[PDB]
Design an enzyme around this catalytic site. Structure first.
Site, short mmCIF file in Angstrom:
data_model
loop_
_atom_site.label_atom_id
_atom_site.label_comp_id
_atom_site.label_asym_id
_atom_site.label_seq_id
_atom_site.Cartn_x
_atom_site.Cartn_y
_atom_site.Cartn_z
CB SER A 47 1.54 -88.43 20.63
OG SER A 47 2.52 -89.23 20.00
CE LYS A 50 1.22 -88.77 16.95
NZ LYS A 50 1.53 -90.20 17.21
CB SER A 108 -0.55 -92.37 19.79
OG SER A 108 0.18 -91.13 19.93
CD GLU A 144 5.14 -88.30 16.24
OE1 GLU A 144 6.28 -88.59 16.64
OE2 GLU A 144 4.21 -87.98 17.02
CB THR A 215 5.39 -91.35 25.43
OG1 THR A 215 4.22 -91.87 26.05
CG2 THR A 215 6.60 -91.81 26.20
#
EC number: 3.5.2.6
Length: 267
Positions: A47, A50, A108, A144, A215
């Site tokens: 992530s 982002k 996130s 994602e 993660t």
């Protein structure tokens, strides 16, 4: 020189004892290297991308090709794993560009990230933004959640610690964004809701720090951002791979990296 040796030695002790690899780059506001470890090894971004995605959004707002209050409509199809804000706004039917970007950065939120990707032209447009700001390394290939699959050896969806640290510096200190947009994204990073147990937990309590976590599957745990210590500004990128650690132990690992960084900076 002795301080750099302590930094290297102390990271390598964590690596050996935790069966982990630690990628770190710390750079000054101009991108000059302060210290690093495995700094040109590729790691899955998870992530962390982002934060650059939000920088791209702000650049488009600055340039007039996007508006922060533009309403992005969606249906239940846009809900993916870990979409806390997107799920809350689903009944209303939309999130604005800015709501989505703030949720992407500070929670996130994956659905909000994909909503922005849909609007800016997908992974290819994210990668073009990296290239525009001088990052020839970072690449977004998927949306994602599959961009976080972190298959061993896969160069898709990766960066290096040094490329990403220099991208953080360019966005925050290199004039990539207006002073308004720079300040907004910096405050978002300070107020990030997902980083309390990772890098910033290992820094002195009086350092101003803002960061974006990641993660991934297969033991990826990352944290990128900026800190101000002793009137000096730094950009930092930490990527770690620790397949045999628990989630909590990986948080502790990144916090320990924060302590090792602190010891170098203090010395």
């Amino acid at each position: 020189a002795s301080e750099k040796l302590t930094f290297k030695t102390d990271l390598e002790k964590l690596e050996r004892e935790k069966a982990a690899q630690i990628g770190v780059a710390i750079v000054d506001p101009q991108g000059e290297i302060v210290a690093g470890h495995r700094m040109a090894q590729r790691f899955a971004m998870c992530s962390t991308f982002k934060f650059p995605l939000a920088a791209l959004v702000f650049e488009r707002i600055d340039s007039g090709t996007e508006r922060g209050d533009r309403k992005l409509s969606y249906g239940p199809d846009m809900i993916v794993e870990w979409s806390p804000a997107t799920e809350r706004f689903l009944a209303s039917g939309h999130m604005t560009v800015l709501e989505a970007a703030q949720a992407a950065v500070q929670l996130s939120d994956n659905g909000a990230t994909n909503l922005l990707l849909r609007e800016i032209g997908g992974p290819a447009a994210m990668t073009q933004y990296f290239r525009k700001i001088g990052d020839s390394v970072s690449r977004l290939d998927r949306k994602e959640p599959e961009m976080g699959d972190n298959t061993p050896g896969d160069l898709r969806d990766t960066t290096t610690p040094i490329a990403m640290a220099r991208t953080v510096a360019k966005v925050l200190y290199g004039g990539a964004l207006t002073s308004t947009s720079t300040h907004t994204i910096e405050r978002w990073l300070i107020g990030n809701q997902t980083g309390d147990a990772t890098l910033r937990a290992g820094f002195p309590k009086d350092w101003v720090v803002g960061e974006k976590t990641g993660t991934c599957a297969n033991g990826g745990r990352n944290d990128i951002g900026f800190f101000k210590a002793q009137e000096r500004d730094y950009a930092v990128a930490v990527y770690t791979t620790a397949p045999k650690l628990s989630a909590v132990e990986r948080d502790e690992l990144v916090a320990s990296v924060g302590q090792v960084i602190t010891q170098l900076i203090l010395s």
